[PDB]
Paper text:
The HIV-1 envelope glycoprotein trimer (Env), a gp41-gp120 heterodimer, is the only universally exposed viral protein on the surface of HIV-1 and, therefore, the lone target available for recognition by the immune system. Env changes conformation to facilitate viral entry upon binding to CD4 on target T cells. This leads to the exposure of highly conserved CD4-inducible (CD4i) epitopes within constant region 1 and 2 (C1/C2) of gp120, known as the cluster A region, which contains non-neutralizing (as assessed using assays measuring direct neutralization) but potent ADCC epitope targets for antibodies (1–5). The prototype antibodies for this region include A32 and C11 (14, 15), mAbs that recognize distinct non-overlapping epitopes.
CH55 Fab crystallized as Fab alone, space group P1 with a = 74.0 Å, b = 74.0 Å, c = 75.9 Å, α = 106.8°, β = 108.4°, and γ = 91.8°, and in complex with gp12093TH057 coree in space group P6122 with a = 90.6 Å, b = 90.6 Å, c = 409.0 Å, and γ = 120.0°. Crystals diffracted to 2.46 Å and 3.8 Å with 3 Fabs or 1 complex in the asymmetric unit, respectively. In both complexes, most of the contacts to the β-sandwich are made by the heavy chain of the Fab, with all three heavy-chain CDRs of CH54 contributing to binding and the CDR H3 of CH55 providing the majority of its contacts. The vast majority of contact to layers 1 and 2 are mediated by the light chain for both CH54 and CH55, with CDR L1 and L3 contributing roughly equally for both antibodies. In total, CH54 buries 2,121 Å2 (1,095 Å2 from gp120 and 1,026 Å2 from Fab) and CH55 buries 1,906 Å2 (984 Å2 from gp120 and 922 Å2 from Fab). Second, both CH54 and CH55 interact with the gp120 inner domain 7-stranded β-sandwich, competing with C11 for residues in this region (residues 83, 84, 86, 223, 224, 244 to 246, 491, and 492 for CH54 and residues 44, 83, 84, 86, 223, 224, 244 to 246, and 491 for CH55). However, neither CH54 nor CH55 interact with the gp120 N terminus, which in the antigen complex structure of C11 docks to the 7-stranded β-sandwich to form the 8th strand of the sandwich. Surprisingly, vaccine-induced CH55 and DH677.3 also recognized this variant, albeit with lower affinity, whereas CH54 did not. These data indicate that CH55 and DH677.3 were most likely generated primarily against the 7-stranded β-sandwich in the absence of the gp120 N terminus, but they can accommodate the N terminus in the 8-stranded β-sandwich, the conformation preferentially recognized by C11 and other C11-like antibodies. C11 and CH55 both crystallized in the absence of the CD4-mimetic M48U1.
Numbering used by the authors:
A (entry chain G): 44 to 59, 69 to 119, 205 to 299, 324 to 355, 357 to 395, 410 to 437, 442 to 492
B (entry chain H): 1 to 52, 52A, 53 to 82, 82A, 82B, 82C, 83 to 100, 100A, ...
C (entry chain L): 1 to 95, 95A, 96 to 212
The structure:
Amino acid sequence: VWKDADTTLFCASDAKWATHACVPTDPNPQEIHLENVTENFNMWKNNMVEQMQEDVISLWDQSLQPCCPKISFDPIPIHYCTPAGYVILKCNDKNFNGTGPCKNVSSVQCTHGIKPVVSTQLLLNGSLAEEEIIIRSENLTNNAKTIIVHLNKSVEINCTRPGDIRKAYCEINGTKWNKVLKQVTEKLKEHFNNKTIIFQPPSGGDLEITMHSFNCRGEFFYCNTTQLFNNTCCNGTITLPCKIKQIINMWQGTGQAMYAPKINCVSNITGILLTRDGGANNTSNETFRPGGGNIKDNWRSELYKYKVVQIE
Amino acid sequence: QVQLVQSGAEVKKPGASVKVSCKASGYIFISYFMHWVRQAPGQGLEWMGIINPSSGDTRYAQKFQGRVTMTRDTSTNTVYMELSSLRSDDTAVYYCARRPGGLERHNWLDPWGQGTLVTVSSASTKGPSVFPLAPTAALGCLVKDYFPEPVTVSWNSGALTSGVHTFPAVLQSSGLYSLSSVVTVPSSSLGTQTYICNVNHKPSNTKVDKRVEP
Amino acid sequence: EIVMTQSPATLSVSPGERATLSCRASQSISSNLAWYQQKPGQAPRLLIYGASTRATGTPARFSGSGSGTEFTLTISSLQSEDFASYYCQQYNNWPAITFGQGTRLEIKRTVAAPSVFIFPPSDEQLKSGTASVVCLLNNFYPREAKVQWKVDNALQSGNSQESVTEQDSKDSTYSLSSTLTLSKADYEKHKVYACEVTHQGLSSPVTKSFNRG
Ligand SMILES: *[C@@H]1O[C@H](CO)[C@@H](O)[C@H](O)[C@H]1NC(C)=O
Ligand SMILES: *[C@@H]1O[C@H](CO)[C@@H](O)[C@H](O)[C@H]1NC(C)=O
Ligand SMILES: *[C@@H]1O[C@H](CO)[C@@H](O)[C@H](O)[C@H]1NC(C)=O
Ligand SMILES: *[C@@H]1O[C@H](CO)[C@@H](O)[C@H](O)[C@H]1NC(C)=O
Ligand SMILES: *[C@@H]1O[C@H](CO)[C@@H](O)[C@H](O)[C@H]1NC(C)=O
Ligand SMILES: *[C@@H]1O[C@H](CO)[C@@H](O)[C@H](O)[C@H]1NC(C)=O
Ligand SMILES: *[C@@H]1O[C@H](CO)[C@@H](O)[C@H](O)[C@H]1NC(C)=O
Ligand SMILES: *[C@@H]1O[C@H](CO)[C@@H](O)[C@H](O)[C@H]1NC(C)=O
Ligand SMILES: *[C@@H]1O[C@H](CO)[C@@H](O)[C@H](O)[C@H]1NC(C)=O
Ligand SMILES: *[C@@H]1O[C@H](CO)[C@@H](O)[C@H](O)[C@H]1NC(C)=O
């Protein structure tokens, strides 16, 4: 009984793109438990992220179009679901890393309040790692594939535009952030046998992937994350100089956009995107850099615990 | 297996409230949601609400928000429906149902309580009077002057079922119901086979077993 | 927000014909849905779930296409069992399990004469308050018919109660009962009691009577 498949997954919002196109929130789910079965997952190769990318491109260009008027934009949780015939099933292993067999598997129909927010380097407003901090990668061995660390406790961040001036800033508690940073350092040591760890700024080039780029309440902020990735951390409140730039390069596809001519965002940091490097002498140290690039990763970070299949 | 059993018919005055039960059997009582729906001849069916007999959670249809309430007794595995402020047009038959299946979800209403009827009236309930209709030929039983419906009529304890016609009752100006149960039979069997009607009125615990003879 | 709408409200078809229902959803309930059947007097039966699949325990005459917004139910070679009401069912919005107003279905049958008989009042009923003669029209079609009471040629009015039967599941006919309610003071005053039947499938008005005794 049952086999993996593909299906134009529908959506349930709890609304008050989710206008008519998403059904009201199911106010009574039913994760029905499954037993004696050890199913294999591949967060890195499912089409839930394909569906998700195409749908969010639709909503993205629809609601904040490039030049171009000015109205609100903040995401709201949007469950996804399978129609009759097809089953989402759910890995409930607290320490499942995205790839491989899960035994505490149980099936249900709608996801969990997915907040479709796209970002770089740092992951925002998502669901935390249930038990201990998780590190997700298609293979730790090959470095071209990026790393998605998923935090145990989230860290809030405040980005602010104040007077009508040129650019903006952003603030973070150095205390808890450097604590959780050393926590993930300990974990990365665990998987690379107690090796010394080194954070460094991104290589450069495509501004967005060498910056913390994200759209807050209509406008795009680029925060210099050189401070957050300090090797030697000095634990006072940390400031970031963030560029609110009117010219962007489009995550939509090939092309670049411009958006027309007192605002604030608070957000939880739930994950980080990190690229390794290449130590052939292996040093006694591995170095990590803030990553990003393919928007695809953003969705895997939240759809690792699920798989769409067909009931037979 | 998959077996639900509701309460009987009931008549409590206008502006009051009523409780109808629904005992489920053949599966664990708690992993499956209990739904309540209703029918009033003059319209069709419409859904009233959802109870989770694992939680106590209730989500309701808009029109029935407030008047209806749901309850569990997950031990003697029964669900209780309670309607109140009974205005005269709430009189109807109410069904409880489940959402069967196996794995995944897909919750289609499989088993279905046979439904209880609720006549919100202002009149004292009274047991019916059963009577003969003696004459291929045909006979019957006249059950008249009763309230409330429904009264169930079975010939020869349900051994005579083809040719039996049980009409819908009529309310005559006196404020009571009357109906009749007739049956067609071979002309030769009259006097040869005994024919008796079991008339059972559940509200006022009535069973009259009256034998018809030419 | 998701308004469901049935297709025809009532229906009249002959045995062996084709019948089609539609369930129109004002919004994508996303290919769930389920079709149910309720005969007059009994507890509704589910026919189809998942928009399309037949529930093993129903004949293959039924089926249901749709997938998305518009849905349909098809009965091929409909038979006498089918004459009842049908409904469609949302249920992916877990709780918003909402119906349509329904679709009653009815017979176009052969016109048939009413097997007519008459019962005079009871011996146990006479020494109670009242008497009531009853005239039965049995297995007739169409449904439209009429009966009027005669007592010593006196046409009666305002004291007869009539009740017609469901389109029978076996022969798709109707039955009808006319109950004439009199008092023993009024019942014993006259002798000849007749009921007069007029029906579309008869050549002339028919009557059936009894002299008191
Ligand atoms: C699960 O496996 C155990 C033994 O490993 C067995 O006793 C039980 O019946 C199995 N259950 C199912 C549903 O296969
Ligand atoms: C799987 O985890 C859930 C918590 O999400 C728990 O309720 C369930 O009992 C677990 N299953 C097993 C087999 O331990
Ligand atoms: C989260 O996980 C870390 C290991 O990554 C472990 O110390 C503990 O379970 C949690 N830490 C905190 C600070 O909550
Ligand atoms: C994830 O865990 C599986 C075992 O279930 C292991 O084979 C794989 O190497 C792990 N990958 C990462 C990135 O931790
Ligand atoms: C975020 O920081 C700004 C800057 O001072 C402050 O006005 C705002 O209240 C802060 N919000 C939270 C939730 O800390
Ligand atoms: C930062 O947050 C931590 C909570 O872990 C709190 O204890 C600390 O006082 C905060 N520091 C500042 C400077 O706000
Ligand atoms: C970020 O800040 C550091 C130190 O302030 C500076 O050396 C670096 O060039 C900056 N990079 C970007 C992309 O702003
Ligand atoms: C690390 O923090 C110390 C705090 O005194 C600061 O002097 C230094 O420039 C920081 N380095 C980086 C790379 O952020
Ligand atoms: C995260 O959620 C909060 C509250 O829902 C919202 O105000 C904020 O804008 C969100 N962050 C982003 C980057 O949209
Ligand atoms: C985000 O942070 C706010 C601030 O306390 C908290 O109330 C909310 O639950 C957090 N959301 C997530 C998904 O962590």
